[PDB]
Amino acid sequence: MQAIKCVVVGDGAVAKTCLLISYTTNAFPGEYIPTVFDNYSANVMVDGKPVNLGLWDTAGQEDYDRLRPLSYPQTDVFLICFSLVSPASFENVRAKWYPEVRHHCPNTPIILVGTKLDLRDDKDTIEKLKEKKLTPITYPQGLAMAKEIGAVKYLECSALTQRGLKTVFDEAIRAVL
Amino acid sequence: YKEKKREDIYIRYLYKLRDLHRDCENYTEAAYTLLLHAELLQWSDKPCVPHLLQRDSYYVYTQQELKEKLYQEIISYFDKGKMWEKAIKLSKELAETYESKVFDYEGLGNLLKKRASFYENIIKAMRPQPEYFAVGYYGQGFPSFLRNKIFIYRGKEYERREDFSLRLLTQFPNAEKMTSTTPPGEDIKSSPKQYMQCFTVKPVMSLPPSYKDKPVPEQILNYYRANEVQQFRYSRPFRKGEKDPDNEFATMWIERTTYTTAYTFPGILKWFEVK
Amino acid sequence: YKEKKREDIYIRYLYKLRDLHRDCENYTEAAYTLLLHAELLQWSDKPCVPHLLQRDSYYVYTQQELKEKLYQEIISYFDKGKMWEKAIKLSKELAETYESKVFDYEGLGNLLKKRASFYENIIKAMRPQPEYFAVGYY
């Protein structure tokens, strides 16, 4: 019987907490219940034995850069996250999130994860980005950033569909395993 | 057959099902079935009907002795069935019968040795809690007993909703899911093209009798947490109020859906319809 | 004293007699005496009177716990007293108390281990029958 530490950061405009809580709840898509606290946890079997785990829900505000690194030490893996449909989220990750994280814990396997995979090819979202002059940035350049860090894996998932979501968490767990 | 009370063939199919469960190693369900058979017997000494005398071995077999053999096997099953509460329960009656009717104290000693091992297991080791999902059969291509029927499945220790969903997709053609997870679909109440839906439900906590206030350690309750259960609630999100941006709780109303089935898990079957 | 109900000194002489019997290794009589003491207690949790709190050790001792210690000792005596029927009898109540009030299943396991040993002893070995004589004091 064992447990795994796992951190998740990212701007608050993508609501990764929704994804995490939906997964742990095993809930139906679009049916999760928002709690009042952060840092969710679950006990999961991936292979051989079930293992406990907890997901540090870390708020992505720039100011909490004083408190967030204090959570970093001795975290088995970390999960860097973003929005596939927010070019600004890309700018933050390549510019703020990725740099300072790799600075803080340069020695830990990392997985980059997409978001709003359904909204990536959402034609209305795409045309809103185009008319707002933003790019519904697709996989291959996300793969490029994964190569840029050489992250142990990169994946794209969605909340309204939970597609790959289970795979996302399984890859996260078997990153240690 | 139970309805028709033709009990011998009833037992025959009982053993059929027992064979099935042994093939599936569903030791719990197997033990329940075998018990259900043994329930027929009595601790009386006269073998009253050779109907209960099955084809596995056929000679005198006082009702006592056959019942004893059955209880031995069932206890063995429950042991390797990793569910010891009923094991100890039945050990109690068996020891009673030993002490009061056969007086074979050697069997007493072995049986209580086993019971001590049981208690050790219970307090010492921990057992995973199996997830329970509710299955909604909708459509008309379903067989008669399946169409427009809702079932609850005692899933494995850590089956994710979609793992079990896919496993059921294996069981069926026309493997589709509607999205209106909570309410039914009236057309598909009558339409063909079998429709299904899966979702975990909350195993409503049972009441361990006479436990309501004593500082009983958790292990007992965590066992009772998922096993020996019949009630199942399912939460329901809903927006009821103004969608103020900073706040979600100005709208939060939950239409939790409660489910009461006929028979309490675990049972002879790894699932059951809602009642 | 039993007639006079002054129970504390009653217990004191009870322990006196228990000492005597232990000197004579009359484990049966010792167990009966110690039981007769333990009979006073209850499986209640409040230690109601420190009178029953004797001088062997003196602190909280819920009536339950003291009764449990007493029953343990008595069972031990009956065991080495080579008279197991009452031993099993009392083991039954003790296990009941364990399961219903303390829920310490470890004690359950040890106790039932002992009870199984008891049944084995009873069926297996044989015990001589003591002769009883009548004495006429005149």
Curated annotation (Swiss-Prot), chain A:
Modifications the protein undergoes after translation, according to the UniProt entry: GTP-bound active form is ubiquitinated at Lys-147 by HACE1, leading to its degradation by the proteasome.
Effect on the protein of changing V51L: In MRD48; uncertain significance
Domain of life of the native organism: Eukaryota
Membrane-crossing segments per the record: none
Modified residues ((Microbial infection) O-AMP-threonine): T35
Annotated disorder: Intellectual developmental disorder, autosomal dominant 48: A disorder characterized by significantly below average general intellectual functioning associated with impairments in adaptive behavior and manifested during the developmental period. MRD48 patients manifest global developmental delay and moderate to severe intellectual disability.
Protein name: Ras-related C3 botulinum toxin substrate 1
Swiss-Prot record, chain B:
Ranges where the DOCKER domain occurs: 1-275
Subcellular location, record wording: Cytoplasm; Cell membrane; Cell projection, Podosome
Lineage top rank: taxon: Eukaryota
Binding partners and assembly: Interacts with CRK and CRKL. Interacts (via N-terminus) with tensin TNS3 (via N-terminus); the interaction increases DOCK5 guanine nucleotide exchange activity towards Rac. Interacts with ELMO1.
Family according to the record: Belongs to the DOCK family.
The protein's role, per its UniProt record: Guanine nucleotide exchange factor (GEF) for Rho and Rac. GEF proteins activate small GTPases by exchanging bound GDP for free GTP. Along with DOCK1, mediates CRK/CRKL regulation of epithelial and endothelial cell spreading and migration on type IV collagen.
Record comment regarding domains: The DOCKER domain may mediate some GEF activity.
Name listed for the protein in its UniProt record: Dedicator of cytokinesis protein 5
Encoding gene per record: DOCK5
Full protein stretch here: 1231 to 1505 of 1870
